[PDB]
Amino acid sequence: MAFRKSNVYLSLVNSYIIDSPQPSSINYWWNMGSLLGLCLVIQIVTGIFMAMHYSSNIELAFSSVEHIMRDVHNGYILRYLHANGASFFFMVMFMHMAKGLYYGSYRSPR
Amino acid sequence: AEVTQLSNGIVVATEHNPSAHTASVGVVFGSGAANENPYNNGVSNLWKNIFLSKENSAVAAKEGLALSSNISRDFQSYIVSSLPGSTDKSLDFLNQSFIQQKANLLSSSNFEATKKSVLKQVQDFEENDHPNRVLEHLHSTAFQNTPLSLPTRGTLESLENLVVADLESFANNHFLNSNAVVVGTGNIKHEDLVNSIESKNLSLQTGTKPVLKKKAAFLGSEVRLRDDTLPKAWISLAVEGEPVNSPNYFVAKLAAQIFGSYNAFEPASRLQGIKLLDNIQEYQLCDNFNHFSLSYKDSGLWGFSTATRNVTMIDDLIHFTLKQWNRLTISVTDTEVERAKSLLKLQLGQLYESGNPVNDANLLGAEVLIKGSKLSLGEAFKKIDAITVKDVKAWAGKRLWDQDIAIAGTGQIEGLLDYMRIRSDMSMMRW
Amino acid sequence: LTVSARDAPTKISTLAVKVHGGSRYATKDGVAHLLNRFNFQNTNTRSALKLVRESELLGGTFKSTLDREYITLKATFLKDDLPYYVNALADVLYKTAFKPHELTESVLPAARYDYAVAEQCPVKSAEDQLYAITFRKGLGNPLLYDGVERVSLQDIKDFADKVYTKENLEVSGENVVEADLKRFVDESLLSTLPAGKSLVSKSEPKFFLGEENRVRFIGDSVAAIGIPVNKASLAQYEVLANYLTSALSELSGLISSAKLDKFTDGGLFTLFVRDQDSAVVSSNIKKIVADLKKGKDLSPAINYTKLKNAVQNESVSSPIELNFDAVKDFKLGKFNYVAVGDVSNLPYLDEL
Amino acid sequence: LTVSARDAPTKISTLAVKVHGGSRYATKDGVAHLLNRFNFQNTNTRSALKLVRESELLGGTFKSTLDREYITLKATFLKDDLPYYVNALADVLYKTAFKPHELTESVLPAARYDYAVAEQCPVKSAEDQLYAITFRKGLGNPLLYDGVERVSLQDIKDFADKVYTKENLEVSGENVVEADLKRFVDESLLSTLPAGKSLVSKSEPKFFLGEENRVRFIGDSVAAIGIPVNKASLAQYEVLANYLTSALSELSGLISSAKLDKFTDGGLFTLFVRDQDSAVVSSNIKKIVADLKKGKDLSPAINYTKLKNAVQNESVSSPIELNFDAVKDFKLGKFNYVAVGDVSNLPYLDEL
Amino acid sequence: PQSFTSIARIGDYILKSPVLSKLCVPVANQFINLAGYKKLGLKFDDLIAEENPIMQTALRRLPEDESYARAYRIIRAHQTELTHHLLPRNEWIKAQEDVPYLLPYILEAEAAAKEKDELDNIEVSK
Amino acid sequence: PQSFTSIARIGDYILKSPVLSKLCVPVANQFINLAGYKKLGLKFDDLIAEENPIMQTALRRLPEDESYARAYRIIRAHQTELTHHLLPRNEWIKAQEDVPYLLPYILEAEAAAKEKDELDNIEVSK
Numbered sequence A: 001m002a003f004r005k006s007n008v009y010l011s012l013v014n015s016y017i018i019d020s021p022q023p024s025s026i027n028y029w030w031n032m033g034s035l036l037g038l039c040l041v042i043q044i045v046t047g048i049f050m051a052m053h054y055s056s057n058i059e060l061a062f063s064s065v066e067h068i069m070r071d072v073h074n075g076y077i078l079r080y081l082h083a084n085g086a087s088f089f090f091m092v093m094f095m096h097m098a099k100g101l102y103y104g105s106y107r108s109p110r
Numbered sequence B: 001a002e003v004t005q006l007s008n009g010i011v012v013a014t015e016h017n018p019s020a021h022t023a024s025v026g027v028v029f030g031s032g033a034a035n036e037n038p039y040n041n042g043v044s045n046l047w048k049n050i051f052l053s054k055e056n057s058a059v060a061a062k063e064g065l066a067l068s069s070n071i072s073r074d075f076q077s078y079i080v081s082s083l084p085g086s087t088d089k090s091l092d093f094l095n096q097s098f099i100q101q102k103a104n105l106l107s108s109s110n111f112e113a114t115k116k117s118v119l120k121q122v123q124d125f126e127e128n129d130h131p132n133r134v135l136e137h138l139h140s141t142a143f144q145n146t147p148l149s150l151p152t153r154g155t156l157e158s159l160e161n162l163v164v165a166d167l168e169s170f171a172n173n174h175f176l177n178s179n180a181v182v183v184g185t186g187n188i189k190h191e192d193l194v195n196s197i198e199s200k201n202l203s204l205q206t207g208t209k210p211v212l213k214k215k216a217a218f219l220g221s222e223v224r225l226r227d228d229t230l231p232k233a234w235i236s237l238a239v240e241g242e243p244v245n246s247p248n249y250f251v252a253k254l255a256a257q258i259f260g261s262y263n264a265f266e267p268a269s270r271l272q273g274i275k276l277l278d279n280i281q282e283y284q285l286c287d288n289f290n291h292f293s294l295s296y297k298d299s300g301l302w303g304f305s306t307a308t309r310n311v312t313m314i315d316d317l318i319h320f321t322l323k324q325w326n327r328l329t330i331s332v333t334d335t336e337v338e339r340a341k342s343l344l345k346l347q348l349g350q351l352y353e354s355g356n357p358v359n360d361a362n363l364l365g366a367e368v369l370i371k372g373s374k375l376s377l378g379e380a381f382k383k384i385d386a387i388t389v390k391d392v393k394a395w396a397g398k399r400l401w402d403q404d405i406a407i408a409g410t411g412q413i414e415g416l417l418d419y420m421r422i423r424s425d426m427s428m429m430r431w
Numbered sequence C, D: 001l002t003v004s005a006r007d008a009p010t011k012i013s014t015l016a017v018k019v020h021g022g023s024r025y026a027t028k029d030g031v032a033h034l035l036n037r038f039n040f041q042n043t044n045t046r047s048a049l050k051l052v053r054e055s056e057l058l059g060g061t062f063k064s065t066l067d068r069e070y071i072t073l074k075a076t077f078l079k080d081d082l083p084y085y086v087n088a089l090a091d092v093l094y095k096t097a098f099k100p101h102e103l104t105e106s107v108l109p110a111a112r113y114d115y116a117v118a119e120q121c122p123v124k125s126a127e128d129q130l131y132a133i134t135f136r137k138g139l140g141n142p143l144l145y146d147g148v149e150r151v152s153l154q155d156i157k158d159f160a161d162k163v164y165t166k167e168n169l170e171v172s173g174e175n176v177v178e179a180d181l182k183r184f185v186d187e188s189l190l191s192t193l194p195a196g197k198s199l200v201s202k203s204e205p206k207f208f209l210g211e212e213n214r215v216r217f218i219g220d221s222v223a224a225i226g227i228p229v230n231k232a233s234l235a236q237y238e239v240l241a242n243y244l245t246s247a248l249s250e251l252s253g254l255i256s257s258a259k260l261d262k263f264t265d266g267g268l269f270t271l272f273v274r275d276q277d278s279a280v281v282s283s284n285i286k287k288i289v290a291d292l293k294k295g296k297d298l299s300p301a302i303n304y305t306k307l308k309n310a311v312q313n314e315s316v317s318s319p320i321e322l323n324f325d326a327v328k329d330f331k332l333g334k335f336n337y338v339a340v341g342d343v344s345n346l347p348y349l350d351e352l
Numbered sequence E, F: 001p002q003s004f005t006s007i008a009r010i011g012d013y014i015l016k017s018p019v020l021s022k023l024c025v026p027v028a029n030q031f032i033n034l035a036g037y038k039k040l041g042l043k044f045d046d047l048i049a050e051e052n053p054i055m056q057t058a059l060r061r062l063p064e065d066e067s068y069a070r071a072y073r074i075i076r077a078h079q080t081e082l083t084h085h086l087l088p089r090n091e092w093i094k095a096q097e098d099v100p101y102l103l104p105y106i107l108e109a110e111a112a113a114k115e116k117d118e119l120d121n122i123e124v125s126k
C-alpha cells in the first residue's frame, strides 16, 4: 500500500485531511471549522510573537502594549492581528454554532 | 510471401502456407461497428448471425464447409474455411449465397429466429460477461458522441426495432467492391484463387460507402456502473493511443509489453520482470491486469484492464500502476526495453503464425484494407528492434504524461477514489 | 525418447515434451495434478525466478498442461534459442528440487484455485463423474487434487521418478529442424534419465455400461450421456459428434456440447445438455435420447468431420488417421448417464 | 384430528401435535425443513418473543422437529397450564404471519446452520443418499434445505395451507387428562381449521434394488448398505438390526451402527460402517456382506429386541406392535449401496 | 426522538375526525408544498433520520427494488443540490406518488421494540 | 543488519583452515558459555531478531515440530527471566544440542531474496 497510508503519522494526516470521505453536497457553511482552525493558529502565532515583548506587571502592562505599538518592528500589525482576529474568531465560531444548531448536527449520532 | 493483386473491382490478398491443411477463402469488408448511427446499431452482429444461421450453415455443411465471421470496430469478415482441394466450392458458395441474391437468408422466419437468438445472447453478454462489457463501456465513453463509440454487439434498446429493411440498407450502403477485400490463407496458391474469382463473375456492387462527418476524437471521461451484487471490481482506464498506420504504433505496443499482463494465481506469472509486481504482491491488490494497445482506423486506446477481489485497496492499485506509467517518461531503463522487445516479438509471432487459418484471414484482411499491402513478420521484427529507449521516452512524454484518461468500472468500486485524483496522479512532482 | 519434429519458414518455434503421466496413471488421485502444477519450479541449479526472467529476456514462454493421459511441457520461443530451451526442459525433467516449503506456499494454492475454478462450472463435474462411472479406476481417476486422499511430498517424488523415465516420454515441436533437435536432445541431461518402463498398455480399458450417477449442485443444471467406444468404432462416433453439434441436425439447438475424447486404446463419446431451468433439461435430454435410439444417417457429415478433424489435428503431436468412409449410420445402444444440478427435477436412466 | 392421551399422577406433562408433513410430502425439496424452522415464529396476534418469554414465565418450553414423515410440534409444561399451551399450538398452526423479514433474518440462517451441521457429518450424508437412491421422488427427497431448488415464501405458505389441515394431524400427550384435553382442543382455534384431505398413502412406495451411489467427501469414509423392507418383513429386519448392533454377533465390532427406520407402509434397514481409514472400511464392509449373504440365526435375539423395542416404543405414542415370534433366520438378497468419502479405495457393488 | 406510533395515533385521530380533517389537512398540504422537498425529487420517507436502530431495521427490511429507487432518489437529491439548482418541472415528485413505502416497516419495527422493552420490565403477581 | 551468507562465509573460512581453527574456536566456546543464553534454556537461533522479511519467511518455512519446541523454549525463557532466576541444572541446553536448526532456512531465504535483488538490477550488454 501507499506510504501516506502506511506511515503512522502520515496515516493520521491522510485519514483526517487527505482522503477523509466528506459528504458530496455540503455547501460553504461547512468550511467554518477549517476557518476556525486557521484563525486559532493565527491567534497563537501572533500571541507568541507579542508575548516575546509583553511584560505583565502592573506598572508595565499598558506601557508594554504601547511599546509594542510604537517601537518594535511591525508590532502594530501583530497587535491589530491579535485584537481583530479574536473578534473574527468569535464571529466564525458563532457561525459554526449556528450552522450546527440549524442543520441538526446536535442530533443522535454526534 | 503475402501477395496482393487488385482486380477489376475487389482486392485479392493471400498467403500460401503449404504445410497447413485447411485452406480458407473469405471476404473481409471495411465497414465494422463504427460506420453507422447509434439507432440501427447491432446490424453488423445481426448480419453475422444471419450468415451463420441454421439454413446457411446446413447448406455449407452438406458440401463440406465451415462458416466463420468476426465483427470488429472497423472491419467485418465472412470466412468459409474448407479442405485444400475444395475451395472453388467455397468460392461459388460465397458467391451464390452472400454476394448475389440473399432472399433465402432474409425472409421473416430465419430473420425472426436469428433476431431472437441475438437478443438472448446480447442480454446474456450484458449480464454475465463483465470485463468485456467494461472494455466496451470504456470505448463508449472515451470516444463518445462520435462514431467510434458504438458497441460491437449492439445494445438491446436499438436492436428490437430492426427489420429486414435495415439489413438490406446496410448491405446496399456498406457491402461494396471498393470497400471489400477477398482473402486466402492456408494452402491455396495465389493464381488459382484469382483464376477462380475471374472465371465466375463475382462483384457485389459498384459504388462507395458513405464517408463519416465526425472523426474519432478522444474525450477524457468517466463512468461507473457500480453493482455491489458482484464479488469483484472490474475497472479499466485508458488514454488516447496511436492508431494504425501511425509511426508511433510499435512503440505503443512495446510500451504495453513493458508492463505486460499478470495473473495472481498462476505461479509462473508471479515471477515476471515487472516492477509493479513488487508493489502489488504484499497485500494482493489485484487478481489480473492486462495492458492493451488497440489501434483503430482514426484513433485508439492505451491502458490496462483489471479485476480486484480486494475492493478496499482499489485506489492503491490505481496509484501504483499510474506511478509505474510515469516511470515510462522519467526513468525507464534499457533492460525493460529489451525484455519487452523480445516478448513483443514473441507475442506478434504467436498472433501472426498460428494453426487456425481464419485468424490469419481476419488480420490479413484488416491490414490490407487499411494499409494496401501486408508488411511481413521480418519487417515488423526489424521495426521492433530499431526502437531505442529515447523513442519510448519521447512517445511517453507525448501520449502519457498528464494526458486525459477515461475510466470505466463496475462491481464494488466505492473504494475507487473519484476522478480528479486519478487524473492528477498521472503526473507526479518528480519523485 | 522419440524425437519427432518438422520445419517451416517462419519465426516462432515451439518445443514440447509429452509424458504419459495424466490421471490415467496416478497412484493416488490428484498426484498428477500436483506434479503438473509442480513442473516449472526450482531446479537444483537455478531458481524458478532465474529461469523465468532470463527466458523472458531470451524471449519465450514455458507452460505445462495436464489431460487424462499426457503431461505436456511446452516452450514457445524465437527460433534461434533452441539449445537453451532444450537444456531448460531437460533440467526441469531431471532435477526439480521438491521442497515442502514450496509445496505449501506455491503449489497447493494453485491447486486449490484450479480445483475451485473447475468445480464452479457444472459441466466439468458431469464430465469427470461420467469418467468415474464409466471407467472405475483406470481413466476414471479425478483430474485435479481436492484434499480427499492426503498426498504427501514423498508420493509426488515417487510418482515423478516413476513417470519421468526415458522410454515413457517423447519430444516433439514445431518450427525446429530435426537434426539440431536430435543433436541437442543428446549431449544433454534428457539422455541421462533412468530408462524405466513405458507406462501405456494397449488393450481396451474395461468399461462399464448402463450406470447412472446423480450429483447435487447449486446453479445451472446439466445432463450428460456417455458411450465408451472401441478403437475400431472411433470413426463412427467422431462423425456422430460432428453431426450432433452441427447445423445438419435438428438436435443442435438442444445439445449444448458434444465431443469424442480419443485415446490410444479407445475413447469416450460424451454429450452435455446445460440450462438454468431444469424442465427444459428433462424434456431436452428425453428428446435427444428418444431420437438417438432411432437410426440416424451419418454419411452427410463426412466431409464436414474431415474438415473439423483436420483443423483439430492441425497442431497436436498425436495424429490418429481415421478413415471416415466406412461410416453409414448410428443407433444408440447402452449408455452411461450423469445428472448434475437440480437433481430431483431430472429424469432417471429408466425414464430415458 | 384424533386427539387421545394418557394419564399418570405426576407433575410434568407434554403435548404434541403430529402433522404428516415431512420430507416425504414436500412439493419442492427443502420446503418442509423451512416450514419446520418457520413454525414457532410470530403469529398474527402475539409475537414469537412474547410467546417465548410468557411461556418461560408460565413454566414450559416448545420444540418443533421433523422426521421423514411427521412434523411434530411439542410443548413440555407444568400440568396446571394445559389450555394455554393448547391455545398456543392452535394459534401457531392456524395463523402464522409468514413474513419475508422473518424468512431472511431468522429462518434462513437457522436452516443454513442445520444443513451445514448435517452435511459435515458423513453418516447423515450416507443415509440421505441411500434414501434418495432407494426411493427416488417419494420418501427420498432431501430432508434439509440446501438452496438447490430456490424456494421463497409463497411455496412455504401454500405448503402450510396444504398440510396444516384438520383431518391430517393427530394430537398426543403424556400426563394430561383425556377428557379436558378433548374439551380444550375444541373451544379453540384448532377445530376451525379447513377439513382438508389426508396425506397418508396406503400403497407401498415403489423401491428400487441393486443401485449404488458414490459421493466424494473430505473426512471419514462410510460404506452404507440399505434394504427397503415391506410391512410383513418388518419384524425380521428389526431383530436383524438388534442382532447386528449387539454382542451376540461377530460383526458389531465392524459395524458402527445399523438401524431400521420404520414407516406405516414399509421401512428401510440401513447399515453404516465408518472409519478414518478406508482399507479398514473396505475389508469391514466386504466381510459384513460376505457373511450376511449366508444364512444367519435370528433366534437368540428375540427377547433382547423385545427389550429394545419396548424402550424404543415407550417414547413415541404411535406404536407399531410387532409380534417378534414368526422370525427364524435371515439371508441377504439384493441391497442398495452408498460409499461416502475416499471413494477410490472403497469397494464397488459387484465386488461385494 | 419521537416514536412513529405516537405520530401515527395523533395523525389518525386528526384524520378520522370530521371537524379537524377539513380544517387541518389543507394547511398540512400547503405546508408540505411549501417545504420544498418534492422539488429535489424526494419522497418524505427519504428525509427521515436513519441513525436510529429502528430505521436501520426498517431499511434492511425494505424490498430490494424500493431500496434501489430510494438510493437513486437520495443520490439525485445530493447532485441537484450540489449544483445549487432544482430538478426540472417534469421530474418533480408529484403529490400522487408520495406514498409511505417505509412507514409500515417502521411501525412494525417500533412495535417490536416497544413489546421487547415492555416484556423486559414485566411484573408477575406479588 | 549483516547478512547470514556473509557470516557463514567468514565462519567457514575461519573453520576449515587448521591454523585459525585451533586459535578461534576455543575463545568462541568460552565466549558462548560466558554469554549465558544456555542457562535460560535457549538455543542460539531463538535469539535472532525476527522482524526482517528474511527471518519471517525463514520462520514460516520451519517444520511443525521445531516451531512448537521453539515457541516453548522462548516462553520458558520469558518466564524464568521474569522470576529473576535461572533454569536448574537439568534443564540447561547442553552444548551438543545447540544445533543450528534455523540456519539452512535463513541461508536459502536470503539467497532467494538476494538473487531476486540482482536479477532485477541486471543489464544486457550494450
Ligand code: HEM
Binding pocket: A040, A043, A044, A046, A047, A048, A049, A050, A051, A054, A065, A068, A079, A082, A083, A086, A089
Ligand atoms: C484562543 C485564542 C486567543 C484569543 C481569542 C485571544 C484574545 C485576546 C484578546 C481579545 C486580547 C486583548 C487585545 C486587546 O487589547 O484588545 C488578547 C491579548 C493578548 N493575548 Fe491573546 N488570545 C488568544 C491566544 C493567545 C495566546 C495563545 C497568547 C500567548 C502566546 C496570547 C497573547 C496575548 C497577549 C500577550 C496579549 C496582550 C495584549 C496585546 O498585546 O494584545 N493570546 N488576547
